């Protein structure tokens, strides 16, 4: 198996524009949304058909109740941060929790929080402690670390429960998540050489340019891996042509254990 991950995000907004939710929570497996909840619908709902098809109504009903409680807790926590920062106006609070199952069978697990889109508190599940970025975070760190049992619970959740969930969802979604669609790759001139790939899945891909068999990463412009809209992805990389000396330029693409070379003549 390739590396896979499960992660859940929460977003709280303290003074949102009318109609815009004060709370949103979305789960992902790899790049795929799997679950959604917000303070307007007040319902947890599937975002992938292989989730809807495999989790009975009792699952969505129960986590809907938990998310209604998590919503309120997020509001209370954001209220507390904005009081201690002494901040007016609308501010954001975010959480990300998740785990990775790596190809070699090892695992990772992570939990962290942000205020106004900047790291705020970062959990270390091995030292069982919270890293605080400033003195408001430091006050919260002291309160959370006083509740040693919840740190132990979170380590267990990240290391055992999260991985179990991930393996369960990976089987549910296996026809989507474990497939391979190889890239279609082409080179053109625009004066720079553009190497362009499309139609590939999974999104992880490495494209680069070599000159005379050597890679100078400082001379390459790397385009982003972008969704095409149909479940597949596209990407590109470019290099500038030296008009004073001839060079052998070649585009190299690695995707899902296959390497491709396109030599420019």
């Amino acid at each position, epitope marked *: 198996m390739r590396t896979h991950s499960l992660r859940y995000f929460r977003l709280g907004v303290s003074d949102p524009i009318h109609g815009v939710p004060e709370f949103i929570s979305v789960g992902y497996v790899d790049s795929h949304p799997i679950t959604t909840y917000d303070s307007v619908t007040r319902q947890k709902e599937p975002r992938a058909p292989w989730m809807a098809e495999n989790l009975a109504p009792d699952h969505w009903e129960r*986590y809907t109740q938990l998310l209604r*409680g998590w919503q309120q807790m997020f509001k209370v926590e954001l209220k507390r941060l904005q009081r201690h920062y002494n901040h007016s106006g609308s501010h954001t609070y975010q959480r990300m929790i998740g785990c990775e199952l790596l190809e070699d069978g090892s695992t990772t697990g992570f939990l962290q929080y942000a205020y106004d889109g900047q790291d705020f508190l970062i959990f270390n599940k091995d030292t069982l402690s919270w890293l605080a970025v400033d003195n408001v975070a430091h006050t919260i760190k002291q309160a959370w670390e006083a509740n040693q049992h919840e740190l132990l619970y979170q380590k267990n959740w990240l290391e055992e429960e999260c991985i179990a969930w991930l393996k369960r969802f990976l089987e549910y979604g296996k026809d989507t998540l474990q497939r391979t669609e190889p890239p279609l790759v082409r080179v053109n001139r625009k004066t720079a050489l553009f190497c362009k790939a499309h139609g590939f899945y999974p999104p992880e891909i490495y494209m680069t340019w070599m000159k005379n068999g050597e890679e100078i990463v400082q001379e390459i412009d790397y385009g982003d891996i972008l969704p095409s809209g149909d479940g597949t992805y596209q990407a590109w990389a470019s290099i500038e042509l030296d008009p004073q000396s001839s060079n052998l330029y070649s585009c190299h693409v690695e995707h899902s254990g296959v390497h491709m070379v396109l030599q420019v003549p």
Partner: antibody
Amino acid sequence: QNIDQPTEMTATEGAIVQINCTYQTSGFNGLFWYQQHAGEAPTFLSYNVLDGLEEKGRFSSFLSRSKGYSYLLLKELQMKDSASYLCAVKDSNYQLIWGAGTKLIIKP
Amino acid sequence: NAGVTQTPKFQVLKTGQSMTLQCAQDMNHNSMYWYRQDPGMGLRLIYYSASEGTTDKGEVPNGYNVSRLNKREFSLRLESAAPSQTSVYFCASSVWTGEGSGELFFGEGSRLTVLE
């Protein structure tokens, strides 16, 4: 999903007693012990979620996740320890599954 | 600092009679629960309220309803008592739910006997 603990145990004042709890659940988010004196409300004793032994006065609580097993260990038994002891496990959906309780009888 | 206060302590009912049990907590807790306790089995959840403004069924909701009246109070209703509802009922609360380690705080219990 089930939780199993003995119905009743009898031990002597001053001695030690180990109350066992085994569980088979869909996922695991921790194991609780509660004390309930006859005619009274349950009260929280302990929580375990990682492996090993935690001590709290005369009481200790042990957990083995791989064996799906916990014990509540009471040392230097006193008559006031006469009570029921309830084990409960939180599953993957944070639902608490309760054991039927172990009634502890102490011989003076 | 009273903790969880539930009433009544004891009640006799005839089959078909209505009854409401009251529960209040003064701990500023968010989550509240109604359990029944019967001989030979573990506590069974009837209904719960994960937060103010929401409630849902537990494992044995039939014959019961609840009202989370405000953050403090969570009442349990037997609209038409049946003899099978003879039991000991416990209200409980916790700071939050959907977290591993947080314990329950229990009320004193309400003993109901429903008779034909």
